[model samples]
Target chain A: MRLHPRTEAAIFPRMSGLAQRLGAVNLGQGFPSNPPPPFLLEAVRRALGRQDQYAPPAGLPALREALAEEFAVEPESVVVTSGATEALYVLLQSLVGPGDEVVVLEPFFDVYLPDAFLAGAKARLVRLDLTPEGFRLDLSALEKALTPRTRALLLNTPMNPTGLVFGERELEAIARLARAHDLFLISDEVYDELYYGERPRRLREFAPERTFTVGSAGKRLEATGYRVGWIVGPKEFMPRLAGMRQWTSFSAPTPLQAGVAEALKLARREGFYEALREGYRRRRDLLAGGLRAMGLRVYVPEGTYFLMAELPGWDAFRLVEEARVALIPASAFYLEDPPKDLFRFAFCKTEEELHLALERLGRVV
Target chain B: MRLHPRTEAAIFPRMSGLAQRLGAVNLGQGFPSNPPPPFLLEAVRRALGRQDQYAPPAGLPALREALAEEFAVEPESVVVTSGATEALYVLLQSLVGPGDEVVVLEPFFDVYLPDAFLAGAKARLVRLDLTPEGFRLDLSALEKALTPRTRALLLNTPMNPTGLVFGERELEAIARLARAHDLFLISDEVYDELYYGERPRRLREFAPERTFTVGSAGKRLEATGYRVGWIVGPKEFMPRLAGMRQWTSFSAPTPLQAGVAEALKLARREGFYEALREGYRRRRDLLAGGLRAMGLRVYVPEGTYFLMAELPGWDAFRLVEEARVALIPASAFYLEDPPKDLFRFAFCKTEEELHLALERLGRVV
Candidate 1:
């Protein structure tokens, strides 16, 4: 059996003792703590009560139609998946083959590198230097990484680990490079709805033919466990995605697909997403304020539930141990050596829970 | 832009035209018409209302424990998946790399051979010739087909298109051969709970080290659209499965996992499975009798919700078009050419639906 190095058994053992210890407020893993929307929940119940039989291998017609409507694309352009993770995996495996290279921006989602490797493609990692102010991608390095062999560029915005949201200029530069190289652009916009910019822009409007956009209801609704996500690209690329999808999971869960469909509908209504963003921003502020007050140099995140902090005097692991807090070591996210003082915390917790965690961290430093 | 030739888009086009033309009874797909159990649905609602956030990358701790307990295996020996399809896909992708030869029985589930190709592994087809009287494996031929590079063998019990359940002796022979070759054994026992045999037997009891047993809730409970399935195997092999699963779908849906957890728990109780088996058996007899009455030669299935019938002069597609009743052509399931006159009719429908379908076939003949 070929055991992968990234399995929980292999990676979990490294943090065995700390992980096992109780009272550890785990902010290491990214999962939403909130319930799914009421509308989605009702749709799930209705699907179970009425249509909880096998849907078409692609998905239920109504749900697929709903997804297409949300994306402003035809139903043929969408492939509903179990999650955005599956969408990424299938698209990469189907489109990329051996001797091909996939360009990826760094401190990228950890799965992106391994997924590329799983597809037998080399990951041309373009380093994105982090500023003392906040994390940002080096556009020049990304431009330089494209080659004739580059089949696709894997990108995630409103990024995980570091909540770095890409701007219109950065997207334009990336799009130009992809077009120049005749490469496919796979943009991971799972956190697209969480953008704090003047307006959220989809890369699809810039380059529709060569671009595949991946999104998820879990992150959008703060219901991360639902595992309902989708991909939208041209119809030609979608068949390959669907073919890979046929073998991957055959279809997403029928009830959850209905639930996600309903969630998308509800997200359009007044204050559904606004309340979510406002609430998360409050939690982000609470955590950042607490960490900063404890003499920790914190970077403000533009979007998502995470922020990175640097504490010069203490070891990141020791702080985690002493504070009984679980924070991801910033080095885990990097391919190259990262600064020793940096650690990442996900602020996706209840206000009361965050307060308790903040109290414990405040006592430690 | 490359579409696999076999996956022609026109094969199963969205049924908008068919639905509009007449009141089409959908027998082309397999799924139960009945609602899921109330307690299971309640569990799903509970999970949605509370735990519809992200689960651990592997799966929920409770569901994994439930799977291990239900399967009578160690907790470390199981990997929860989006479904058995993803479970097999993950295993195939991780276990068999390029140039590896994976063994598959002829007349296999339609997806297995294609999945092997999708993973870039060469599929070596081994024909298991079942007697016309009884659909049983040709063990002598099966044993002769194994070679040193045979990395895995795919087996489906209570098989699709032909409902042949392998007996102990047959399973033992296959198990011994797999053990001798040190090959991975992927047993699709999705219909295990639906069997009319002595009891549901798993390969894990024969050889725990190399065996991976997959089960699906859709088949057992007649709610195929729920799309819940799982994998149980040795711990050493599970990490590789996890590595693949971490990319494909990440984990199954939170609500469905909770719902399936409850269903499996209830299924272990005294009456639920017996009731399900009895219902399928009755429907099987009704369909078999009805087809025989219409002068069609029929083969009764012991487990699955399907029966094969030989329509002497009628082409399967012609029958579908003429009678306005859809039946899967037997040739679609086979790797090699099979008896060309055979067609499959699903017996999982309501009695009125099955009767009306058979009546329609009677009128056409």
Candidate 2:
């Protein structure tokens, strides 16, 4: 069986397996080390035994309704997916086809390039410039990347690997470009709740008619294993997305959908959302601060739990192997010609584990 | 955003929604109306809190080991998927592409045709003939459907809608043809445990090198909502399928994977397997017998929970609407020229509900 080249190119699985074999402290994959909130687990416990039937292809109506209420969108505009992963997949399948082009920001989440390939769309990348201040989107490059065949823009904010949150001005520029080109905007906001500053402005706020905003309960509730994510978009586009979903995975597990619904409700009422932001902020501060103290050129993230750092005269891959700590090379995030000096470290680990990881790096360096 | 025509053509969501609005005794969709086994639910509850991260892309190792042990294959040959739906999807994504032709039996499950289309393959249909005895595979017709471009045959035994389990002779004929043609066989054995007669033969037993055997816990555990399924195939193909899975949905829910592992162990030890077959057999007899008594020409199934019946002088679509009892038109399962006199009724509901449906049909007829 000949697999897609991009699918064959995925590196996370290999790195993760290597980490396990080496018994390394893994700060590579972007998942929390902690269990989900107790109330969410209780919700799943309460929902067991009754979910023996398939959920509606669009997902559980109650969960969709809850998501709609939270997002301030109509219920018809929301479609729950297995994860943000599937959300991007079905969106690509429904919107892009062979001979079409999709604009993506460089140093993307790993799935974006492959998803476009699987959908038979050509991806045109716009690089994000790493300034001393932080990573910033090159708006001119984004504008140059668009063409008559460009059907969509895959925008990931509080972006993976780089941990750069696109500001309102940047999102406005993107929204303007999408509108000018009549391109659909797939706003991946899976890490929207993980920001250390004010809540990131949703691109949908600027391009409401064209933007499909994707969110994940996995990030918000620290329940990645639950595999529940959602997309809220213009009502007109939902039926097509839902139709594409019907043939893909059908629907997410119904019990998890119900659990996420309860989680969203509790998150809103019990200030769990704010607590999550505060907790991640502290971890980010500790990790980024520690890296700076070690004289590493660290990009202190404004949002998300990732810290990208430059290690002079060191091979990032070799450093991870020798240090017995797993960190992903920045090249894994790029489509081509990635900078060799940088690596990404996740701060979603416990303080003790983070400290241990830093100490291990200290000995190796 | 233009969806693939076949994806847009799906009708189950509309029919299911209509069934809900009409308060119909729904036999349209193919999911059990009962709760899962109590022990499986307990397993999920026990495993929930710890599963707050992504499962391995190939799925949980323990579950894969359990599946491998049950299937008597090496653990490296098994890859867990979100469901049989995703199992088929990833397999197609990995194996088939543009210029490929997939052979599917007409009067088939709805997903097969569209899945092939999504994978950029042409579906070559070989119709199963309904005879005086039952639906039978026409070997000559199957042979005639093959071409040089034919890459795979999607063979679903104990098949949905028809419920005709392929006997050893039929399976051997297919295996011989597949080997002679050097074709890949995607053996969808999701309903393997639901047969009323002897255990169904695995195509992989005869054509081990090329057959991909897919199975689902949903049917055996009566938990369609859990969405845990797996593929056991040649060792060489596992990595490709796992790679496709990594880019698609990543993995199924970890708690459900843990639950299914426990369910597989208990099912083997507790005789739950025999009880499931016996219970479904009773439901089948009650519904099939009741239909025959009403002077309807019914093809009593050898396996699975469906029965195909000839309702002459009636519009199958109208029958469901007017009777307020949901039965899918047989045409929905066909690629072309479906027998207008036939409809499919699922016997997966409780005996009382089946009886109530029969009564409702009597009044309408």
Candidate 3:
């Protein structure tokens, strides 16, 4: 069987597997090492007895209603998915077809390019120009990338591998472009609840009618294995997304959706989101401070659980093996013209694990 | 956003939603009313504490190993999926591309046609000849449908909405065609464990090298809400399917996969499979006998949980509303040239529920 070419070329699984085999202090994949909140576990227990039948294709109504309430959207606008991963896949499939183009910002979440390929669409990547301070979206580059055939823009906030969250001005510029081009905006905000500073600006604030904003309980609730997420957009596009979803996986697992619904509700009622923000912020600071103390050039993350650092003379893959610490090479996040001397570290680990990883790196250096 | 035309044309959601609104005994959709086995529920409880992060994209290793052991294949041959729905979607995406054709039997699962279209392939449907005896695969029609553009054949055994389990001779003939044309065989056996009499024959028995056989815990374990299923094939194709899966759902819910692993193990060790078979067999007999006794033309199901009855001169859609019962019109299963004088009834509910549905059905007839 011939796979979509982009999938055949993926590096995430290979790197993650290598990390597992080598018993490295793994930071290659992006998932928290901590267990989910106590209330979420209780929710699953409550739901276990009811896991006999399929949920509705859009998702369990209670879950969708909870997500809609949380996101300040109508229930009709929410479509619960297996994760943000399937949310993106179905959105791309619904909006983009053969010979269509989806403008993607690089460095991207690993799934973006391959998902576009699976949707029979081509990805037109616009590089995020790296400044001394951090990475910034190049508006002109994005404008140059758009064409009459461009159907959508895949915009990830608190972007994976880089943890560069787009601010208000940045979101405005992108929304302007989407509106001018009459293109759909697929805003992946799976890490919306993990920001270290001010809450990141959403594209929907500027272009509500044209934007599909996706969020995940996996990231916010620290339960990635549960695979509960949702996409909220205008009523115009949601039914179509639900139609596309029906053929993909029908619906997300019912019990998981119920559990996530409870998680969302409890998190809101008991200040869990505030606690989560504080926790990840401390982990990010710890990792960034440690890397800086090691005299490495680090891009301190403002949100999400990742930080990218410059490794001047070392191949990141080789460094991972020698140091016995798994860090993903930044090149894996790029489509072309990648900087080889860069690596990404996820700070979702415990402080002890982070310290040990730092010590391992110190030994190698 | 424009969806695939096939998805846009789907009626399952519309029918199911109507069923819900009318508070009907929902025979329109196929899912067991009973909870999963107690052992499976216990396994889920055991897994709750560990459900913090993502399982491998191919699914949990322990679950894959268990599935492989049950199917008599190496662990490398198993790729656990969210459901057989996704198992089919990924297989179609991996094996068929633009301009490629997949031959499907008519009156099929609603997802097959849309999934094929989503993969950018055309579905060449060969109609299952509905005879007085039962529905039969037209081998000559299937042979004539094959062309150089044909990449695969989607063969569903113990077929949904029809419940006609293909015999050994039929599987061999189809396998012969697959081998002769050097085409991939995508065998969907989600209902393999629900046969009434003889065990359903697998296409892989005759064409292991070319067949990708799919099975689902949803139907077999009676946990459709769990969304755990798997595809077993030659190691050659397994990796590619996993690659496609990575860009789609990434993985099934980890807790559910663990639970299903236990379900598979316990079902074999105990007499769960034997009991499930006998239980469903009785339900099938009861529903078929009731329909026939009502002076309706009933096609008794050989396997799976559905039976089709001819309702000549009645608009099945109107009948659903007037009768206050939720049977799916057989026309929903066909691509074109549908037989309108038929409706499908799912017997997966308890005898009480089935009896109530039959009583409701009798009122209008």
Candidate 4:
């Protein structure tokens, strides 16, 4: 009743409802249709009943240790959360409040702006305008958005929607602004392992003194329903975030935390993430190449599993109705005045699902 | 860094650390010691691999339907959450903010006051002072706590720390105050089915227009780690809470939700809750009766798994060190000066575990 400037109904539910009504092949949402690899499944199966009591608010020790080792941080520095989603809320609410601003690059994950607003802060959204190369951040605009009251710069590499990875050029510029402003950086790295090229170095490396680097096992393992994620930062701020966690979710589901821990160790030893990345790279080519062949002017992604494309004169509803395929309008990622021609298609589904969407969309032209 | 007066480190961790250091039988925390029942285990086991993607932010449909049916509310009225913990934070944050005040009764669950404060609201704490009957809320004190700035009243019953279920007189009085003020009421009824006498009428029955009744699957299933819970409220406000959740945890663990949904149905049809209540009553008698035998001035509880008693001049540290039993000091539940002689014991453990604590404390005498 008191929350300011209430949000509109979420875009996902509306898009999903239309897609379901039309029975469209959904390439819009980001969840994978493929089952998790066997080792991860077995790990969770073994963990189903092991610890059915509350884990520490910081998370299970084993899970935190695994996350810590992966980030090369002390176990005390990582606070496990329900997902990268919750980590953002905990971090934002703990570190920033009314009159503070968080600089966000648009088009961004839909959660970024609302999470900031929900924490009683403003999200200063700077557009990652589309270009010949791909969707790219304009550093000057980002720098202009930051002010004395700016508390953080929030970003994602292997980014959602546009699937544009931040390379050294944009990253160094961001780090410079964050440092100059003495601002924290909230790096959403849930898609960290999904890059098709040389790995995108975490933004925390650029600004370790002021970064909360977030990661999601759900994204890494392709089992989002497991809902385990973590924020790795300097140890000092972690306890505050953990304190916030106690009032919000009270630690991630404990047995699943153990499951994710086991899956993490197994994924590392078995080179599962490497194989998973290769598979997504394969799926990306199938979806992007197919869309390009159909003259959709697709921007082939450099990282993550989404393709941003322009099919001029097409609206989301028509695409779902005519082509029997659904993709989110780029406007969903923008707060206002989004480009009308761009849409995003997720390639996380299996090759067969991707092929079917392509086959249906190909016939629309 | 921005949170007000930053909550001191959580009481549970401080006490749990000391308890672990002393190798004491842990009764200070609230999670159950026994494994989840077979029906629930099987339900979750069967659900593990079923939904590997995100459920709707509100929750899995099956879970929501089950909860809605149980509460006799429309499905739209229920919003499933990571746990009742997250539900409180979401509700408080959504409904109350800066300059607003929430009325809370002490000894309360530790989460209530902080959750309200974290939402940028003030907590007007009212004491439930100890009495011959048990810890009893002073209605006049509660009425005084309400003011023009009051936004909600947060109460838990069967109450924690002191397990006094609110009777008709208190419930009606609270309802009248809430109605007179037109303030919201957030009733934390996580232990709804744990009463020893006739089932406590939900506070919603007294003031449905203003009530947000929170429930816990963890407490119900003896599976605190499951972390699946719900808020059943007026449908009009459910959307705002759902939107808030989108920016929080997104949704509860999907498989665990299905597990809880299945358990709710099976527990209903098979009379599991009745059996569980009887079992808890048995454990309660064993612990409370034994403590009385030791002449500790135990206040036997009518509901929940906790016992509150006064031992003059005894401190928490001494109890852990000398008696090898750990219980929370009532001061943990209060914001300011609290009675120092009172401590809380959770009798949720097995007869043997409760007996062991009795044995160790019996030796202390």
Candidate 5:
């Protein structure tokens, strides 16, 4: 139980290694291929003027204040983390323990199940239905998955790979279930700004008392290397998270936190997020449009930098070898009986890189 | 057990809070009050030219290579973490689980016990005796603490608060015990560079195959906010630590890793580490000199930036209240019935700050 038994068979590394060996265009991993905005880089350099000593373990005052202002909460309500990744790991341990269950929606991010198991808790998976209208939650399935032992409901909005942003109806249903059961909500909103349709509502807005909302500057600033993320919740839950924060990384890099604080302020003024949303929207269309035009079925995503596709009778590794382009298999995301003949493509790369992968993908098709 | 039971009374925060509220000279927490080296700041600026995307989840090649070179290991044997703090957290979870026991020395770093508990393991604590010679490990007590279920032995040297770095004899005895029990050794050498005595032996040098040695760039570079730390261990254990790394912070910030890499190379070239060691030695003497002159019983540390003193019949908070100088109670570091009337003082601050704190202490004494 201490080890993820399937860690050896992890798809991203296996597929990514193949991509590297083949010298193929990597559309497999989801990090951006571009540099962070210029202002953010300058902000980090300027942050060197601040203390080089440790920040307060929970967060630097500057970063926490910025997040609180942006998230519409008091600074005390925000706990900065090394990344949303740490936020998730810390939350699982802090919120639940042995014999408790955490409700996870399938298909989920690769780390979600491992995070729960590592906390010595069971993961009760509830799959969203893939309907004619696209992937939507079946609230009844979620209710079935929950029991008295369900300590939390963990979900990601503008969901990874599937890119199915939960609408108001589904959000309200989840919020009510959590209320009825008196459960915490681990809401991952790393891709919150990547939406293509009407903006997804913050899950914390629905259950402010129970929700621990996660956001990442890595994704927001196009600096996935920044490694700065945060959790905003009610004041009651913030201290424990901060306490747990001390034992993990102590705090994120001090300069990065200050840099991010400046970026947040500057981005709000310069409309960088809106510009980012527009740029990713274009990349999504280029990849999704190419796959569909190739007589393949592609789920035109509602958000996130990923799109899922049906590539019938094709082995993903063989596709990598033949087309010289890499992608993640959908099977990696599922807990059980993952659907066959499906793969996930990332559109987070630059246009030239995406076009190269698309052109190579066309040959294989 | 999901929450640490005594987290509310965590001494550093409580005393540090009192210090802040009363405007005391805060020697309570152990972070340097100075800026990082100019070369390191320049390294980070140079690193901004590198990719802003996530590095390989295990670590960036540059930083790993730097650690590998310094530690005399292959790059595969090193896994970079957000900090030594995270490396410790990840190791506890990876090395031990439910029904297992981990041997810890009393007067341990406060996080050691909680980390063991959070891993669903038992911490079988062995107390280091504070004798006429100063704090030293009792091999017989350590041997008694181990059972068939013991998974690992975690220790720090130049040990925190006490500054007792393990000598050849103590290190050898520990290595022998771990070998006999087939246990792993989590040797935390975060203060390795801060030694004032004959250089402490790397515990991994004593037992390489079963030891995971942790080091901190934050301490070495005088930039605690950098949050770049690492585990240099045998290749057999490195993969699992790296596998667990993905679900944690994913990776340390890319630019910071690159910066640390350059700093490591340049620091070696400039002979910066020896200068840092020499500088800290002076600070320790200055602080210890003042306390002993006031007729206090002081145990001068051989390593680390902290020393222990017996302030007989004085309440620590009262000392803070009367002297307006904050010091952590030695009780904070011990797992059981910590010695009373003993306090830990940090000499990590500037010389001027230490003088001010000592003058305040003189009045109270």
Candidate 6:
């Protein structure tokens, strides 16, 4: 099977090749710029020196326990994976069969659509229309996407590209639809902690039995290089996920998992999540204000480290060339080009880097 | 599908679990006691700070070229993967369709059989008989197992568990069989560099058009935590492998690929293969001698990090429990219980650790 256009867009001929040539201030890539916390780094160093071995087929027992504890779930309900990618891959492959339909939010994490396509499932993209000001989820569209063939709803809170964080009201609506249609909700909560609003609503908190919460240490601790993530769900579904995980990558990096256990422990503490959110929130404001001052119509992100800006009549590529600032064309995020004038800029960079990006932006427009 | 027994055996469940419980000296896992070489670690640390985002879906272009260079092949022929596990998964999924037959050498890597099962392919095992001296491929039996329905021959040279390095003549024979029957030949060369013989033979070198050479950084460099590996084959087949790899894990870890590229370059310059083989040779000799001393029938492996020993009248689990040392029973490796008395030990450890394992053996006779 051929790669979905989104993967080709996210990867392949144009993206990496251009990223290399321009060496432009990178705001298109989705990972964090901050290093893993110092304590976590120390844990990794210790594990590196002593525990750099193959972990259990599922995960290290301690790591699994820590993940379960963080999610307020049991250890048996969890399965550690290479990353959230594999966790999603295993869950999608396990739960859905050929000819199944997987419901997805518009402008999703990109992998979800391709994963469903590759798994021989029809990926039905239900557009969560962006508000006139901010790129936010329109909950009504989601309720309308339900059908008899719908096997799953691929949900990502603090949505990628759009940076829209769903509230408890939105989550309740989703839970109602899921319960009504008997649809399995595969929640991508990798960016759950990177919120701008009040605490991000977790689907698991509302409907734990029906939701499979997929998360990663990379996004949580800004350690994308580590590639440690996990999945938590009911026993019936978890066995299949574990089974697929065992056959796919066998196990995640042994030492990395050990490091992530420490990361989860720290992240679960009372203040850690709030501090992280505020740090990113400050950076988001800076980047958004900078873009606004530079004449781009910047829509402040409610969550995630992204700012959606309407470029008006300017060609996104021409902007990339002239501005020497690489931003993901928001048109690429949606299933269809519903908004051609918009683009996404990741504000996950440091304050200094955001200033540099803004400095470059002033010269272009 | 549930995990294969051999896969479970490959993971040192007892040592990992009991170590936490009884405070035991852990040696059941197969990984280097030492961290990756200094140069490899430096490469990783350097790559970490760089904008080492997601590498191309196939792999980093330079690393793929490096892999091709090491194999004396063209760059277009290579498809880098997350690890050898993903490489195998991709190849199995790509080559074997439902109702097809995949002739696997018995006691294969744990994932091979399960992957075949997952792909709806019938995995037909042709037992590789391990004598008191060592393991040998039964070419006649392998040829007999082939039929019109056969889609591929799953062969692992410098094989895991048994540590049998297939000789030039054996490789040539397999290659001929593959050509005659029009079967896809997937050669797992992950341990090619760890052989005790003069040098390991690659079937791809003899038959470039059809053979898919699978290799891993984890086995050679002893840094499995940095999961990078590759498959090289014809341009036509590369797409299929790439297709499956994309659907499976999407891409390998970006920074880890950078680390692997550097490790690969160093491996090429400093004779990493020779050094690795030399180190494994010493450990192999120690284990073989120790097992023989314990009145067990030891298999003198030619290559790879493993040796087979016959327990004869003793129960395999009894020896693992009472001896306080864990070993993989040969029965788990086969479709049926082909050999009841044999157990395998991987010699992937430091010289001191090898001796310590011998000390743990105490006296078994």
Off by over 4 Å in 2: A1-10, B1-10
Query: Per-residue CA lDDT of candidate 4, range B90-161, in tens?
Result: 888787877888888877787787787777788888888766666778888888887899989998988887
Local distance difference test, each candidate: 0.75, 0.85, 0.84, 0.84, 0.85, 0.74
* Model 2, span B187-302: residue lDDT tens: 88888889898887778888898899998888778999888899999998788788787766789989999988988999889999899999999999998888888888998888
Candidate 2 clashes between residue pairs 3 or more apart in a chain or in different chains: none
Candidate 5: segments with Cα more than 4 A from true spot: A1-10, B1-10
Docking category of candidate 2: medium
DockQ score for model 1: 0.54
Cα displacement (Å) at residue B31, model 2 = 1.2
Supply candidate 2's per-residue lDDT for B251: 91
- Candidate 5 on B117-217: residue-level lDDT in tens? 76668889888888988787778888888788888999898889798878898898888988888898999899888898787788888899899989899
lDDT of 1 by residue, A100-174 (tens): 888887677767877877766788987778776667778777777877777888888778767888778888887
Q: Which of the CAPRI classes, incorrect, acceptable, medium or high, describes model 5?
A: medium
Best by lDDT: 5
Candidate 3 lDDT tens digits, B1-365: 45445346336667777877887778766788889889988988889888658998888999999998988999999998989999998888778777899999988887788788766789998998988787888888989999999989998887887888888998899888888888999888999888888776788999999999999998888888888889999997787788778777889999989888887898999989899989988888888888888899999888888899987778756866788787777778886778868888888889998898889878877
How would you encode candidate 1's per-residue C-alpha lDDT over B1-365 as one tens digit per residue? 34223333113333324533655665655666678677677777666687777666567778789888977777777788877778777777666756678888877776787778766678888876656585667877777777776788888887876777777788888889888888888888888877766774667778778888988877766567666678888887776676568777877777777777777787778478888888888888888898888777787777777778888888755666678777676777776587768777777779998888878888987
Q: Over the stretch A29-84, how does candidate 3's per-residue lDDT look in tens digits?
A: 78888788889999988899885579988889999999888778889999999888
Regions of model 3 farther than 4 Å from truth: A1-10, B1-10, B20-23
The per-prediction CA RMSD against the true structure, in angstroms, equals: 2.8, 1.8, 2.1, 2.0, 2.4, 4.2
**Poorest stretch of ten by lDDT in candidate 3 chain A:** A1-10
Interface RMSD score of each model: 3.8, 2.5, 2.6, 3.0, 4.0, 6.1
For model 2, how does the per-residue alpha-carbon lDDT over A1-365 read when each residue is reduced to its tens digit?
A: 44434346445667777888887889887888889889999998988976656898899988999999978999999999988889998888778878899998889887898888877789998898877676887888888888889999998887887878888898889888887888899989998888887777888899999889998888888888877889999998787788777777888999999888987998889998888888888888888888888888888887778889987777645766799888888888887898768898988899999999999988876
> Candidates sorted by lDDT, descending order?
5, 2, 3, 4, 1, 6
